[PDB]
Write a protein that binds this DNA or RNA. Structure first.
Ligand SMILES: [Mg+2]
Ligand SMILES: [Mg+2]
Ligand SMILES: [Mg+2]
Ligand SMILES: [Mg+2]
Ligand SMILES: [Mg+2]
Lengths: 149, 143, 213, 101, 67, 134, 66
RNA sequence: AGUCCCUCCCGCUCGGGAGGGAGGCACUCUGGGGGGACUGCCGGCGAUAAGCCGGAGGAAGGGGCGGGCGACGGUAGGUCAGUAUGCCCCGAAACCCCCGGGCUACACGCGCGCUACAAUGGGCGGGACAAUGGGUGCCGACCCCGAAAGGGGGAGGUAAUCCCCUAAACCCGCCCUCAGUUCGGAUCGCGGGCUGCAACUCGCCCGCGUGAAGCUGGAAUCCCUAGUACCCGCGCGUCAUCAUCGCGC
């Protein structure tokens, strides 16, 4: 099976786990002091908020192909609570994402297609589909209708 | 080992709350500055505040008294570039309101435009006042 | 929450895939031809019935209930005390949240009594629907309050509406939730207890309806 | 060959079809293939304005609108026809542009 | 306490503001069980309905020649 | 052999393809069994449950949708799937049950929004401002 | 030019500004550098209030205009 | 979509999936031309006429639904401060330019709105799906510096091609548990930026800190009949910068 065969959140939770063992992924020097975008109010709460971001970034260039930094900032934006005035949509920062992509490049999972963004490698597809299959081999016990495909 | 009331640099803080909110009470430490110091000190922001042994209180008091030298960066500090010396400082309860008060007196001396508004208790940042800011009491004509 | 219930696939055309309205039995001959109980797996009709006179006769009772909780509360007429204008945090169009609270409501009802939740509901909507009213009829120059009789359809409407408003006032600025306050109302009305709101309103209508015949 | 590409665009709809059929027929009479007039999306420019000079009275508005119909024709290049489409003499409210690929 | 009655014919709209309807019912179980009387109802009514009433003797006042 | 049908529902189009298989059905690549807003998952399983677990196990369908929202594409899927099932099996004692349960499963919905008008013009065609005497 | 930024040259002397109708002296001292020149020459006379008149309230609007 | 090659992934492959490139207008789409609905067909009122009720078959039914087009006249209604214009005053000025101030002043009465008074919720991490429109004095993909506002480079676009443009309410998981609170974010201190010939009077944007009234609203009064009211976001206009507004989706 592939990543098209399970819900997103379960797969991301399971991916972020094995991700903690790649020596290239490691949080920068200003990770404990940063909120993720001008539209938030408080800092992230868990301690491994890094690995979830990175793991959501893999699955995001798997099934999105050539995608660029200024397009991963529209995805990670939200609605702002700006006092006595109505709400409004805003983009996100840049550093937390650029570092993620450079670290995944150094790991060996993505690559810089010139002029058109970044795409995923064969190593990355193996990485992601192995985990997708590992998970689904147990989501069919309690859901006996996936057994077909 | 459990306790009910602890104190760090003046204001005393509850003991049944999480550590990051227990520090909010200290005038001079919001919520986003508390997460930071709890992380830098080396202990969780979710532990019950009553479980704070006292050497850790010593650690926290150290940090709150010159946080720039322990990792707290100088873009997240109560006041940078002190008007008397370019050092970057973070003040708390007693020292705070006095610093603001003298920063107001300084504008009262030279008789600026932003000092006279502070004098007469009016807006300061360019609002309009035909319609709002009615901090007074009604006036009548005839009936 | 458990992944077996989060992912739920039916294999029978029942109500919500859980409960079957094959044995429920309506007592009142008046309200029998208006309380529909056909198979109708999913309760959603996309508002086609509100175009045709007496269209709402053939609409499943569970949908008539779910629609009468998609509202903010009491917005120009106090209910047991105060207004309860709650705008921008009311569920006016959010049918998903409505369907969810009613699902959990039934899951609680089925546990504390032990009957097909729709049988308990169809008991609640008869011990709460009154059949006398009042009006003013002008006659030759003047009017005066007189008593009249309520047709069945309007009985049913008033019944469901009062159940709604009864549950929607104990979840207000109080620790109790909304799905469980929709149960502490049906278990009461279906038992004729005074502590209810739907039943008490029936009694205090019929009183000042009889006292001026 | 080199598949000339002609682009007509005008505001009167009728006075476009006639030059279209001229091109179609000219192509047909001689020996050449052609891709019939491919309609492209209309571009309608819209201008909302108030209605009264002063400011008294209720507020009532206008909706002026101008529509521009386009087409597109693909054709080969034969001087017998490449020339034959030069004496075509378009009307004055039509635009034509020719270019090869 | 329980007397039902089965509408057979509508007569028109009374009411200070067009609210109530006069209608000729037929009782079906109890003291009369067959008599025909005239009553005012609030709400909408078709023919063949089943009202529930509580007296079986009130006989609402005649309407203005039905128009 | 293959069939393919359509369904539109207030700016949402759906293209379906039906053919023999093991009884699975995809939507944009998702398996039908995994659709999160349960009220939108029970909405596209009504044709495939009103036909029985016998016909539902001899076909494969695979639709594609675009436009609208999570509930204006579920209904497009349902219309296309009903119109496909009523041709593969090609009977009429099943087409009948697709008119007693819900007539629109085959005729679709002809309703669209309505333009706005100038008194607020950002709230709707008939909602206005608040009058002010005195 | 009320826009001029006070600088360590001007500390000590006393220059003028133009507050709309007249030139008003501003004896420059330290602790002014950084501020704007026109910041010290106010421009609207402080307001002191008389008494409401015919129209200040709905009780004296039509009972006067006949 | 159905065929044909090549590359790459998974239970190691029988089966399933993702990209390319060759070919085709099947389906969607764009837009020119025709068809379709007429009280036409049955039953009942009314005369047997005008017409009105109910039922079929139908994608649609009884002006099919929503808009454009406002008669003769009146209102001594508004506009001479959009242009045109008669009479009377200015005519070295009440004409024409330039610098600085005001229209942004604040014991107070009122009209229209925005945010809240919390659980029919607040925060943190993940997962979903739009349409109208606009761009050469301009729209900026992609790469790299910055914690954030932003900065240095810079393909492709005179347009169904390139760009604005992976919307929010919605769902799953964890913290809070009925408190002036993890509700509410006015008011103020310090530091970093953008547009501009010029940001004090009086522009907009970011980070840390302080944390006011407010616990559902008296007599009164407003808008709405179906894809309509309510709830949530988006695009043009005005524009060197600034949308709690107008007009559309
Ligand atoms: Mg006039
Ligand atoms: Mg006049
Ligand atoms: Mg003004
Ligand atoms: Mg808050
Ligand atoms: Mg300024």
């Amino acid at each position: 099976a592939t990543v098209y065969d399970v819900p997103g959140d379960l797969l991301v939770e399971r991916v972020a786990q094995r991700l903690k063992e790649i020596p290239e992924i490691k949080p920068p020097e200003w990770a404990p002091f940063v909120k993720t975008g001008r539209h938030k109010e408080r800092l992230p709460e868990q301690e491994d908020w890094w690995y979830y971001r990175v793991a959501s970034i893999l699955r995001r260039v798997y099934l999105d192909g050539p995608v660029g930094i200024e397009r991963l900032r529209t995805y990670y934006g939200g609605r702002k609570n700006r006092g006595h005035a109505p709400e409004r949509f805003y983009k996100a920062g840049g550093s937390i994402i650029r570092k993620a992509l450079q670290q995944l490049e150094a790991a060996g999972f993505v690559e810089k297609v010139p002029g058109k963004g970044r795409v995923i490698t064969p190593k990355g597809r193996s990485f992601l589909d192995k985990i997708a299959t590992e998970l689904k081999k147990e989501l069919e016990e309690i859901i006996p209708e996936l057994k077909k495909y | 080992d459990f306790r009910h009331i602890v104190r760090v640099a003046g204001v005393d803080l509850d003991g049944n709350k999480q550590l990051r909110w227990a520090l909010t009470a200290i005038k001079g430490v919001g919520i986003n500055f508390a997460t930071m110091v709890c992380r830098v000190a080396g202990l969780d922001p979710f532990m019950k505040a009553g479980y704070l042994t006292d050497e850790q209180v010593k650690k926290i008091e150290e940090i709150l008294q010159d946080p720039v030298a322990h990792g707290i960066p100088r873009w997240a500090v109560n006041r940078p570039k002190d008007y008397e010396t370019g050092r970057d400082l973070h003040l708390i309860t007693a020292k705070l309101d006095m610093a603001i008060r003298e920063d107001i007196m300084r504008l009262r001396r030279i008789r600026a435009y932003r000092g006279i508004r502070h004098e007469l208790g009016l807006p300061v940042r360019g609002q309009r006042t035909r319609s709002n800011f009615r901090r007074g009491q009604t006036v009548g004509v005839s009936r | 929450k458990p992944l077996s219930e989060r992912f739920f696939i039916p294999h029978e055309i029942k109500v919500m895939g859980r409960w079957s309205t094959e044995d429920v039995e309506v007592r009142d001959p008046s309200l029998k031809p208006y309380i529909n109980l056909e198979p109708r797996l999913l309760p959603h009709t996309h508002g086609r019935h509100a175009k045709k006179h007496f269209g709402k006769a053939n609409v499943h009772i569970v949908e008539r209930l779910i629609n009468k909780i998609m509202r903010s509360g009491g917005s120009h007429y106090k209910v047991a005390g105060h207004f309860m204008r709650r705008e921008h945090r009311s569920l006016n169009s959010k049918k998903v949240k409505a369907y969810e609270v009613v699902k959990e409501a039934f899951k609680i009802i089925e546990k504390r009594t032990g009957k097909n939740p729709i049988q308990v509901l169809v008991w609640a909507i008869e011990n709460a629907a009154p059949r006398e009213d009042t009006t003013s009829v002008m006659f030759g120059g003047i009017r005066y309050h007189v008593a009249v009789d309520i047709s069945p359809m309007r009985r049913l409407d008033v019944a469901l509406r009062n159940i709604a408003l009864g549950a929607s006032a104990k979840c207000y600025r109080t620790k109790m939730s909304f799905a469980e306050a929709l149960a502490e109302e049906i278990i009461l009305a279906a038992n004729k207890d005074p502590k209810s709101y739907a039943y008490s309103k029936k009694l205090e209508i019929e009183r000042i309806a009889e006292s001026s015949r | 060959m080199q598949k000339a590409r002609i682009k007509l665009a005008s505001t009167n709809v009728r006075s476009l079809e006639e030059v279209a059929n001229q091109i179609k027929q000219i192509a047909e009479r001689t020996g050449v293939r052609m891709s019939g007039p491919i309609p492209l999306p209309t571009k309608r420019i819209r201008i909302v304005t108030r209605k009264s000079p002063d400011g008294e009275g209720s507020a009532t508005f206008d909706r002026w609108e101008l529509r521009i119909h386009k087409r597109l024709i693909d054709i080969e290049a034969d001087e017998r026809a490449m020339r034959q489409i030069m004496r075509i003499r378009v009307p004055e409210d039509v635009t034509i542009e020719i270019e090869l690929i | 306490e329980g007397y039902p009655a089965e509408v057979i014919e509508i007569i028109g709209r009374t009411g200070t503001t067009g609210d109530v309807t006069q209608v000729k019912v037929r009782i079906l179980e109890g003291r009369d069980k067959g008599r025909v009387i005239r009553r005012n109802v609030r709400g909408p009514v078709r023919v063949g309905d089943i009202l529930i009433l509580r007296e079986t003797e009130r006989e609402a006042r005649e309407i203005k020649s039905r128009r | 052999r293959i069939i393919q049908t359509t369904g539109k529902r207030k700016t949402a189009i759906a293209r379906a393809v039906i053919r023999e298989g093991k009884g699975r059905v995809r939507i944009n690549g998702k398996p039908v069994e995994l659709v999160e807003p349960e009220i939108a998952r029970f909405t596209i399983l009504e044709p495939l449950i009103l036909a029985g677990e016998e016909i539902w196990n001899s076909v494969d369908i695979d639709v594609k949708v675009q436009g609208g929202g999570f509930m204006g594409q579920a209904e497009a899927a349902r219309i296309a799937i009903a119109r496909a099932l009523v041709e593969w099996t090609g009977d009429m004692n099943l087409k009948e049950k697709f008119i007693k349960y819900d007539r629109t499963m085959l005729v679709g919905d002809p309703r669209r929004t309505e333009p706005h008008k100038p008194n607020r013009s950002t709230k709707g065609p008939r909602a206005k401002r608040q009058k002010s005497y005195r | 030019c009320r826009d001029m930024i006070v600088l360590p040259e001007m500390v000590g002397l006393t220059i003028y500004v133009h507050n709309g109708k007249e030139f008003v002296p501003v004896e420059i001292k330290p602790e002014m550098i950084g501020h704007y020149l026109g910041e010290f020459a106010p421009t609207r006379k402080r307001v002191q209030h008389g008494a409401p008149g015919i129209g200040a309230t709905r009780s004296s609007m039509f009972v006067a205009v006949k």
